[PDB]
Amino acid sequence: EVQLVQSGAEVKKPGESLKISCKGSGYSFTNYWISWVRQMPGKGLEWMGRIDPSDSYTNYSPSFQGHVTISADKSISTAYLQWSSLKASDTAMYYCARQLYQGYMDTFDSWGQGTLVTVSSASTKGPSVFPLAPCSRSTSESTAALGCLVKDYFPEPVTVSWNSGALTSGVHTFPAVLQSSGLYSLSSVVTVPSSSLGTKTYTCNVDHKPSNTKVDKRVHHHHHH
């Protein structure tokens, strides 16, 4: 098969340089152009530039002209995208794609799996985990919600399970939000029968590979009022 495989996820600080790669296989590398495309968090696709690997002739979007360098090492069927000095705003998914000229236009017929680039001045940090539980006299239905707030970690992602994976039904783990501190925060919740509160125990298990931490939190409202 025609295949493009990109280098792995990157986490960098502003001002650092970076070079990411795209290796093509299952075709004549020099017969097809490669394009680079940017997709910022929650946004659409942006064409950055292209390169003809047969002679390294390049074209850049005016938006990207002067900010990135596209290159190719045709001897190893690899294309590259590089920055001399990263900025936080360069945080995005980057795709390489093969161009196939059909119907008299260039089309992006084969895509790499993407390379996630995160640029931030933040340093690696494990989360704090806090319970989410209702006030004592607030459970007003037969269904109650519980959860945990996973706060102040970097970088993404964390993984959350409930009762060691025994509990999966009704679980909602929300997208993380980036706080003004530069650290992320997310919540995970679960709905359970109001009757099981106190009779059954609910614990969230929070893994953060980047910091090599794991935090469990048994969830309840500790009442003093």
């Binding site: 942006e46 236009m105 017929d109 209702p134 997208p175 919740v189 009022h225």
Partner: protein, 214 residues
């Protein structure tokens, strides 16, 4: 600088529906338009090129029409695997440019959210911060308004929210909103409330607690 404008930015449809998405270029591009599908976390996939030509391997329920400045992608009998985001791309001239995308979502009946409010924990407060969380569980459609009130004063600039993708079982959304205050600020107030407005509710619903009573 050929600008591509897609509409709508999102739409809700049912399996079996004929879906149409439009793309308009700021100037003529002849037939040189392509269409791509993308699902969350995955790379785009080419569907159609030269306005009307089907990419090898793509189901024939996908079809394209148009020329000049007006184009449409049609999915004629929508399937479960087709819920995704779609992008047009002009290839008339450099630079290649994309439309901003159209998200095709799952239509279902209106469902009001169940609403819950959670006070901050004593462990968090010890560290000097108070997060108050409001959860809206299993609602449809997506459009919802969550307003925080503290001592009956509407809050602004001190909350963040996020929303799940549609549920794989009931096609609903859930939403979490977090209000963040310093401990000192949290402790000077009494009443904490989140007010929720949604199509499924005949009037806004408020969940609240009182410090010292919670």
């Amino acid at each position: 600088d050929i600008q591509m404008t897609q509409s709508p930015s999102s739409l809700s449809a049912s399996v079996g529906d004929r879906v149409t998405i439009t793309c308009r270029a700021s100037q003529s591009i002849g037939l040189y338009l392509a269409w791509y599908q993308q699902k969350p976390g995955k790379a785009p996939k080419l569907l159609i090129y030269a306005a009307s030509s089907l990419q090898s391997g793509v189901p024939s329920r996908f079809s394209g029409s148009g020329s000049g400045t007006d184009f449409t992608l049609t999915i004629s009998s929508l399937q479960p695997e087709d819920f995704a985001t779609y992008y047009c791309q002009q290839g008339n001239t450099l630079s290649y440019t994309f439309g901003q995308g159209t998200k095709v979502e799952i239509k279902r009946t209106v469902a009001a959210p169940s609403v819950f409010i959670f006070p901050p924990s004593d462990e968090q407060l010890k560290s000097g911060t108070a997060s108050v969380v409001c959860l809206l569980n299993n609602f449809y459609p997506r459009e919802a308004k969550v307003q925080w009130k503290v001592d009956n004063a509407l809050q602004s600039g001190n909350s963040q929210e996020s929303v799940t993708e549609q549920d794989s079982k009931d096609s609903t959304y859930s939403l979490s909103s977090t209000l963040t205050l310093s401990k000192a600020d949290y402790e000077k107030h009494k009443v904490y409330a989140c007010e929720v407005t949604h199509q499924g509710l005949s009037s806004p619903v408020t969940k609240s607690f009182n410090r010292g009573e919670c």
